């Protein structure tokens, strides 16, 4: 009984979180009302990892929904699986964060964080043995970014020895709501460097390019982007939600994926990504070559520009496990110049028999690559372009922040980039 | 090629064949190790909380 | 795509083989410390055979036989021949040799003096050579020369009746390149080389070692007739076979090559059970340089076996390409009239 | 009769231990419910099998075993498995969260809080023994529990049972069947602190078992079940002398006397044959010579290495099935003349031979075919140092960059323990080189 507590904060965080519970609820056979209707015991084997069991054989997600304005969480409650969430687990304010990291982190967010921690404390107290936490959020806004990292900081203070993982959407000018996103993202990245064990970096630009160029979506929406994130979140958590020789909890995963405490930012990937030639059976070679292709990755970083510290692939569906080793052992021994030679056997593979909905088989990629430095480089450049003129800072100084805290956040992320650069050589 | 020490019982037998002749930490000390590591974990946690209180 | 690593930058041979592998467009060279390789062109000394054959999914092949040093070591070869029943102590093609340890350090000092005194008393030619070089007909000088050193030496009978080429009245030796693949097939390169002495052989003066030592480095450094009779004191089989027909009315095959092929098989079959990589988690092949002497009776003697040999400049292309065909491509195929002679044998 | 207590630590130890006790029951005629019809002494007796099984007044034959794991999922299989009735709950110990493949976490953080409980439970089994010989400790090298808690347990056992022998069955890490990357660290950390507390350790390389299951049993992708069924056959061959009437390796002390002249060099190489696929139409039964010759082929060793280039310090031949000494000696002579068997000059060039007439038992519905005779050769070779050289090299690659070290320091371990443990392994490699090479 290794329970995980899920938190989703802000607009992006709650919309991606909603789709996540919609996707895995389907895989575990949980209907919108929380009743199980599956046909395999594998669905229930690890059900308690993400779900609580209430009276009447009801399964209720162990999820905490947080926001500083009500709108997004009213949509969730009216959404497909809205009624599946615990009523007490909606924690929201009315003021909003105005895409302002200082409001989420220092003013508005501080007013609401204690009541969120009251809910977290309640879910944890009813856990046989808490694995850790996972947070979904964006870094470009105010609530997910500013209040998200405040929640993490206070969760770590109360649960210092528990694992803290996040799915963090990184802002991109091509899919942007406001010009202050580089400010909000740079401020959050430092919080994540210090207080998370594993951060899945989801880049909105990569999600967009995949929708437009690969999926052939002329006009991608936030919904389309969140379809990719749901599938990815379902893949990276397969090993936690189903049985298999892999086993592994959050800590054992972190121990083998993170060689250095600050370099814990991961590039996730998924295959297939088929446009609508969608019924074609995908062979194992195609799954592997696509999974390792840059176009299939969601950090918007070319791995051929850096070196893999550690790689983890998860294959789902009924396929040849001998042929999985042959193709995986082929991609390594055919591109070994992008794997560091001082971590032996740093490419690991796992198989799960249950495929995602509507797919004969799939592959999820989890790479800890030093190429991720390109993502932080982009953010730093956009930050500096504005900060050198102190442009748009009044929104933040008006919330009590000093310019010194921005200078520090800048020096911290440039440090982070430099730390990736030395391990890339 | 000699066979020495041939022993036989109802469930088997054994023998030897020679082809050629030839030519702690106390309980206390372990407690200190464990408690010392425990103290170092406490010190590192105190530095974390001190960081978070700042 | 096949991957290989190069761990001996000083090998003139495998520098070419590596040059060819890349020329095929189907082989990729990795860093010398990358463990995910198919082929290792390993270092001469202290090659870590224990780390081979443990990479999942990779069939790994190395260009050295772990344990072949017993054949390519001066002292080792002597002990192997004497103590191996397949070769026995009466081995008729290996000069009488004795392993002698310097006195400042089993040992065969008394055994040698026993055979030496026998020769001195029987008026027989009693000249020996010490190496690990000094040539003398007195046992006192040979032993005192080894004690002044600090490593193990070997004293063997000096062929006082070598076959001398005419004109010139000069000594020589024969280099044969032998390739042993992973299946332990013994391939003899059809092209050999004679490293001839450019000075007239003189039996009444072993002090000047320029006419007794046919080494390519001693002739090109201490000989005053280097390159007179053949370019670089190197005669190839075609010319040598022609000389044997004109002067001796015989052939290189009949008079010498049969004995060479016999000696190569005998040495390599003897140690096959000790070095074969048949049922091993990794595979081995290796190129050998056999050095032979020929006396005036057209009898062939074995001088030594080199485990890391070089090649004659004129034969690098042919032999190196041949190594890729039978040794490397046979285990890693790509997307004639063989240059070798297969020496069949029972495994 | 002197008792042997088995201890199973971590996932590998527990699952290996489960497979072994299933085999022991089939070998001794013990039903899943603990009953043993052939045992005519109800709730008592000092027979050979009593070294591994106690007896209740009701006639149940209870293993002298303790299962320890910091997580309950693996040991829960024992509680609900076929042989759930054999064990009582006191013998099965489970925590709530494991060591996360972190030696420091299993040895220090969690180990400190559970060591006294495990000792108390082992004390309960010890108090049932009239003359305890010692302990057999099953564990993995790479697991956080199998490496970290095992070494702590071995340290304490040396304190609480000074005059008792301790043997190990250790799973050497193999990438082909492991998702961890830090196992070289755990392997070296546990060997360093365990070395002076183990009298004889049988290492089983998962790489070797994996390839035997693919090459001989035609398993395209072997699982832990296939691996453990084969491993328990070897373990049974090694412990059979303690459980059956005989005169060779009759007590744990004899394992050290016959196999370990030098204390630190206490890692014998195990070779087993034949391994025949049960799915085969029908195999030709191999002779004494053929299976004895197979013991000198690298392909059926528990650790892949080349004994032709090491030196032997000892050599036991354990035969099961239709074998008479006549054929053994005839096969030995034939192998000395054809093999490269170089003993060290300060050791006799001999072979201790043991014959048990009962042929190997195979689990119904298993992968292994029933054979009429089989052999396990225990040989102390310097060649097994290849396994330390490989492992130490992987250690050096990561430690040069301090990769993953923070996880261990984070649990209270000092960075100096790494280097201290590493220098002990360098010394161990040097010992093998002084005895083996000239
Ligand atoms: N042969 C064999 N090896 C196993 C088995 N189970 C795990 N292993 C190996 O053991 C190593 C992993 O350590 P585990 O024993 O699973 O971990 P642990 O001892 O329970 O310690 P934790 O880290 O706390 O889980 C890997 O190298 C696995 O290949 C098994 O049943 N049979
Ligand atoms: N017993 C003997 N009788 C006659 N000549 C001998 C001899 N032993 C050695 N030589 C001469 O010495 C030369 C070879 O020397 P040797 O092979 O012992 O040294 P080396 O091994 O450093 C040269 P390489 O290994 O390159 O062939 C030959 O040219 C040969 O003429
Ligand atoms: N992928 C994805 N990104 C989103 C979504 N909604 C907002 N974003 C991104 O998140 C950032 C804005 O943060 P937001 O979550 O709206 O602010 P918050 O509500 O204060 O936390 C911008 O970079 C948006 O592009 C969504 O549904 N999906
Ligand atoms: C970034 C920011 O603060 N934006 C904003 C703009 C107008 C009113 C309130 C606001 O918060
Ligand atoms: C699923 C995940 O995140 N981790 C993982 C996957 C396959 C092998 C090893 C691993 O650690
Ligand atoms: Ca207010
Ligand atoms: Ca009884
Ligand atoms: Ca002891
Ligand atoms: Mg918004
Ligand atoms: Mg030489
Ligand atoms: Mg475990």
Domain stops at, among D251, D268, D285: D268
Residue A126 to residue A147: CA distance in whole angstroms: 25
Same domain, D273 and D183: no
Residue C78 to residue C100: CA distance in whole angstroms: 11
Same domain, A356 and A384: no
Structure tokens at C242: 């022609």
A107's CB contacts (< 8 A; 6+ apart) are: A399, A400
Same domain, A49 and A198: yes
Shortest distance, CA D292 to any CA of chain B (angstroms): 14
Domain stops at, among A216, A237, A259: A259
How many CB atoms sit inside 10 A of residue D281's CB?
5
Burial of residue D289 (CB within 10 Å: 0-12, 13-18, 19+) is middle
Same domain, D274 and D247: no
Same domain, A253 and A310: no
Domain stops at, among A259, A281, A304: A259
Structure tokens at D347: 């050791």
Nearest residue to C188 (alpha-carbon basis) of C303, C15, C342: C342
Same domain, D355 and D248: no
Residue D387 to residue D268: CA distance in whole angstroms: 12
C337's CB contacts (< 8 A; 6+ apart) are: none
Domain stops at, among D337, D352, D383: D383
Same domain, A207 and A291: no
Structure tokens at D217: 């049993």
Residue D93: domain span: 1-268
Shortest distance, CA B7 to any CA of chain D (angstroms): 7
Cβ contact (<8 Å) for A341 and C35?
yes
Shortest distance, CA A157 to any CA of chain B (angstroms): 6
Domain stops at, among A259, A281, A311: A259
Same domain, A89 and A228: yes
Same domain, A343 and A408: no
C34 at the A interface (CB within 8 A)? yes
Q: Which residues surround ligand 11, an ion (CB under 5 A)?
A: D 11, 98
Same domain, D278 and D182: no
Same domain, D212 and D361: no
Same domain, A241 and A289: no
User: Which of C1, C31, C57 is opposite residue A325, by nearest beta carbon?
Assistant: C57
Count structural domains, chain A: 3
Same domain, D242 and D361: no
Resolution in A: 2.3
SS (H, E, C) chain C: CEEEEECCCCCHHHHHHHHHHHHCCCEEECCCCCCCCCEEECCCCCCCHHHCCCCCCCCCEECCCCCCHHHHCHHHHHHHHHHCCCCCCCCCCCCCEEEECCCCCCCCHHHHHHHHHHHHHCCCCCCEEEECCEEECCHHHHHHHHHCCCCCEEEEECCCCECCECCCCECEEEEEEEEECCCCCEEEECCCEEEECCCCCCCCCCCCCCCCCCCHHHHHHHCCCCCCCCHHHEEEHHHHHHHHHHHHCCCHHHHHHHHHHHHHHHHHHHCHHHHCCCCCCCEECEEEEEEEEEECCCCEEEEEEECCCCCCHHHHHHHHHHHHHHHHCCCCCCCCCCCEEECCCCC
D109 is in an annotated binding site: no
Residue D112 to residue A215: CA distance in whole angstroms: 54
D206 is in an annotated binding site: yes
What are the strands, taking DSSP E only, across A257-307? 265-271
Domain stops at, among D240, D268, D296: D268
Same domain, D390 and D321: no
In B, what residues contact A, Cβ < 8 A? 45, 48-49, 52
Same domain, A366 and A384: no
Q: Which residues surround ligand 9, an ion (CB under 5 A)?
A: A 11
How many CB atoms sit inside 10 A of residue C204's CB?
4
Count structural domains, chain D: 3
DSSP per-residue codes, D84-121: TTTS-GGGEEE-SS--TT-HHIIIIITHHHHHHHHHHH
What stretch of H or E contains D328? helix D325-336
Same domain, D254 and D163: yes
Same domain, A304 and A341: yes
Interface partners of chain A (CB pairs < 8 Å, 3 or more) are B, C, D
Same domain, A30 and A122: yes
Same domain, A179 and A316: no
Q: In this structure, what are the phi and psi dihedrals at residue C244, rounded to the nearest 5 degrees?
A: -60, -40
User: Which of A325, A326, A333 is opposite residue C36, by nearest beta carbon?
Assistant: A333
Same domain, A67 and A125: yes
Structure tokens at A237: 């958590």
Residue C275 to residue C273: CA distance in whole angstroms: 6
Pocket test for ligand 5, best of A238, A246, A328 (most atoms within 8 A of CB): A246
Residue A356: domain span: 260-371
Cβ contact (<8 Å) for A157 and B45?
no
């Amino acid at each position: 009984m290794r329970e995980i507590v899920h938190i989703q904060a802000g607009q992006c965080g709650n919309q991606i979180g909603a789709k996540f519970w919609e996707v895995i609820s389907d895989e575990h056979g949980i209907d919108p009302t929380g009743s199980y209707h599956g046909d395999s015991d594998l669905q229930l084997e690890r059900i308690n990892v993400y779900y609580n069991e209430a009276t009447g054989n009801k399964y209720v997600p162990r999820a905490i929904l947080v926001d500083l304005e009500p709108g997004t969480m009213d949509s969730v409650r009216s959404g497909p699986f809205g009624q599946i969430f615990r009523p007490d687990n909606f924690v929201f304010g009315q003021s909003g964060a105005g895409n302002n990291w200082a409001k989420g982190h220092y003013t508005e967010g501080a007013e609401l964080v204690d009541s969120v921690l009251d809910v977290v404390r309640k879910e944890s107290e009813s856990c046989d043995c808490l694995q850790g936490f996972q947070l979904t959020h964006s870094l470009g806004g105010g609530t997910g970014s500013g209040m998200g990292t405040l929640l993490i900081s206070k969760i770590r203070e109360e649960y210092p020895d528990r694992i803290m993982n996040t799915f963090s959407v990184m802002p991109s000018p091509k899919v942007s709501d406001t010009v202050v996103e580089p400010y909000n993202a740079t401020l959050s990245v430092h919080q994540l460097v210090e207080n998370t064990d594993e951060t899945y970096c989801i880049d909105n630009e990569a999600l967009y390019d995949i929708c437009f160029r690969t999926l052939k979506l002329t006009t991608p929406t936030y919904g389309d982007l969140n379809h990719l994130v749901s599938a990815t979140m379902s893949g990276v958590t397969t090993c936690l939600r189903f049985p298999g020789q892999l086993n592994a909890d959050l800590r054992k995963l972190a121990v083998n994926m993170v060689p250095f405490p600050r370099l814990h930012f991961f590039m996730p990937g998924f295959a297939p990504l088929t446009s609508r030639q969608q019924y074609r059976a995908l062979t194992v070679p195609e799954l592997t070559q696509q999974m390792f292709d840059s176009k299939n990755m969601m950090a918007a970083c070319d791995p051929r520009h850096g070196r893999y510290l550690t790689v983890a692939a998860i294959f789902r569906g009924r396929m040849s496990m001998k042929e999985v080793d042959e193709q995986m052992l082929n991609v390594q021994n055919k591109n070994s110049s992008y794997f560091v030679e001082w971590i032996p056997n740093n490419v690991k593979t796992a198989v799960c028999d249950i495929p995602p909905r509507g797919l004969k088989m799939s592959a999820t990629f989890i790479g800890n690559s030093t190429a991720i430095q390109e993502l932080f480089k982009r953010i730093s450049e956009q930050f500096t372009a504005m900060f050198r003129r102190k442009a748009f800072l009044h929104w933040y100084t008006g919330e009590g922040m000093d310019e010194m805290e921005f200078t520090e956040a800048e020096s911290n992320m440039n440090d982070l980039v430099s730390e990736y650069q030395q391990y890339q050589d | 090629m000699e066979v020495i020490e041939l022993n036989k019982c109802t469930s088997g037998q054994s023998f030897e064949v020679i082809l050629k002749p030839p030519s702690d930490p106390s309980l206390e000390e372990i407690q200190k190790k464990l408690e010392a590591a425990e103290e170092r974990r406490k010190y590192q946690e105190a530095e974390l909380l001190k960081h978070l209180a700042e | 795509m096949y991957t290989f690593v190069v761990r001996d930058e000083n090998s003139s041979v495998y520098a070419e083989v590596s040059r060819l592998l890349l020329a095929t467009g189907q082989w990729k060279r990795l860093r010398k410390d990358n463990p995910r390789f198919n082929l290792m062109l390993g270092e001469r000394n202290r090659l870590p055979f224990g780390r081979l054959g443990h990479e999942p999914g990779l069939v790994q092949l190395v260009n050295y036989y772990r344990g072949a040093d017993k054949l390519c070591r001066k002292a080792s070869l002597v002990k192997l021949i004497k103590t191996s029943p397949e070769l026995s102590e009466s081995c008729t093609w290996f000069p009488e040799s004795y392993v002698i340890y310097p006195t400042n350090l089993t040992d065969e000092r008394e055994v040698f003096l026993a055979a030496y005194n026998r020769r001195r008393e029987g008026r027989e030619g009693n000249v020996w050579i010490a190496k690990s070089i000094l040539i003398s007909s007195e046992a006192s000088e040979l032993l005192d020369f080894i004690d002044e050193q600090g490593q193990v030496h070997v004293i063997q009978k000096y062929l006082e009746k070598p076959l001398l080429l005419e004109p010139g009245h000069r000594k020589f030796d024969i280099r044969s390149w032998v390739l042993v693949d992973h299946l332990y097939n013994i391939y003899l390169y059809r092209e050999g080389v004679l490293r001839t002495s450019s000075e007239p052989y003189n039996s009444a003066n072993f002090q000047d070692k320029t006419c007794h030592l046919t080494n390519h480095c001693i002739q090109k450094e201490y000989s005053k007739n280097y390159g007179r009779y053949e370019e670089g004191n190197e005669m190839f089989f075609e010319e040598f076979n022609q000389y044997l027909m004109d002067a001796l009315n015989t052939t290189l095959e009949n008079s010498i090559l049969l004995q060479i092929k016999h000696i190569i098989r005998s040495c390599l079959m003897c140690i096959e059970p000790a070095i074969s990589t048949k049922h091993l988690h990794y595979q081995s092949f290796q190129l050998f340089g056999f050095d032979f002497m020929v006396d005036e009776e057209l009898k062939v003697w074995l001088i030594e076996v080199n485990g890391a040999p070089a090649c004659a400049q004129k034969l690098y292309a042919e032999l190196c390409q041949g190594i890729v065909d039978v040794a490397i491509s046979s285990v890693f195929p790509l997307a004639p009239t063989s240059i070798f002679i297969k020496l069949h044998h029972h495994h | 009769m002197r008792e042997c207590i088995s201890i199973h630590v971590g996932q590998a130890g527990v699952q290996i231990g489960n497979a072994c006790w299933e085999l022991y029951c089939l070998e001794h005629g013990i039903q899943p419910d603990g009953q043993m019809p052939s045992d005519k002494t109800i709730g008592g007796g000092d027979d050979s099998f009593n070294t591994f099984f106690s007896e209740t007044g009701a006639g149940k034959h209870v293993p002298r075993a303790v299962f320890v794991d910091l997580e309950p999922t693996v040991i829960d299989e024992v509680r609900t498995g076929t042989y759930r009735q054999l064990f009582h709950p006191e013998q099965l110990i489970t925590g709530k969260e494991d060591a996360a493949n972190n030696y420091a976490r299993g040895h220090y953080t969690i180990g400190k809080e559970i060591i006294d409980l495990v000792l108390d439970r082992i004390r309960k089994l010890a108090d049932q023994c009239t003359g305890l010989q010692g302990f057999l400790v099953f564990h993995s090298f790479g697991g956080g529990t199998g490496s970290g808690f095992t070494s702590l347990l071995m340290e304490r056992l040396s304190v609480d049972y000074g005059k008792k022998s301790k043997l190990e069955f250790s799973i050497y890490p193999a990438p082909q069947v492991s998702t961890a990357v830090v196992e070289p660290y755990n392997s070296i950390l546990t060997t360093h602190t365990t070395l002076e507390h183990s009298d004889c350790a049988f290492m089983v390389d998962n790489e070797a078992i994996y390839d035997i299951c693919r090459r001989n049993l035609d398993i395209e992708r072997p699982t832990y079940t296939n691996l453990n069924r084969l491993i328990s056959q070897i373990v049974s061959s090694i412990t059979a002398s303690l459980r059956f009437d005989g005169a060779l390796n009759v007590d744990l002390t004899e394992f050290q006397t016959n196999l370990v002249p030098y204390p630190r060099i206490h890692f014998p190489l195990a070779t087993y044959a034949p391994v025949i696929s049960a799915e085969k139409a029908y195999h030709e039964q191999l002779s004494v010579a053929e299976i004895t010759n197979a013991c000198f082929e690298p392909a059926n060793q528990m650790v892949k290495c080349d004994p032709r280039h090491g030196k032997y310090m000892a050599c036991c031949l354990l035969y099961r099935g239709d074998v008479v000494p006549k054929d053994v000696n005839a096969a030995i002579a034939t192998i000395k003349t054809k093999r490269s068997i170089q003993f060290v000059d300060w050791c006799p060039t001999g072979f201790k031979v043991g014959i048990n007439y009962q042929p190997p038992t195979v689990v119904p519905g298993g992968d292994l075919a029933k054979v009429q005779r089989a052999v396990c050769m225990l040989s102390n070779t310097t060649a097994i140092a290849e396994a330390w050289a490989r492992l130490d090299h992987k250690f050096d690659l990561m430690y040069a960059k301090r990769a993953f070290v923070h996880w261990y320091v984070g649990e209270g371990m000092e960075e100096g323990e790494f280097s201290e443990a590493r220098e002990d392994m360098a010394a161990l490699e040097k010992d093998y080189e002084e005895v083996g090479v000239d």
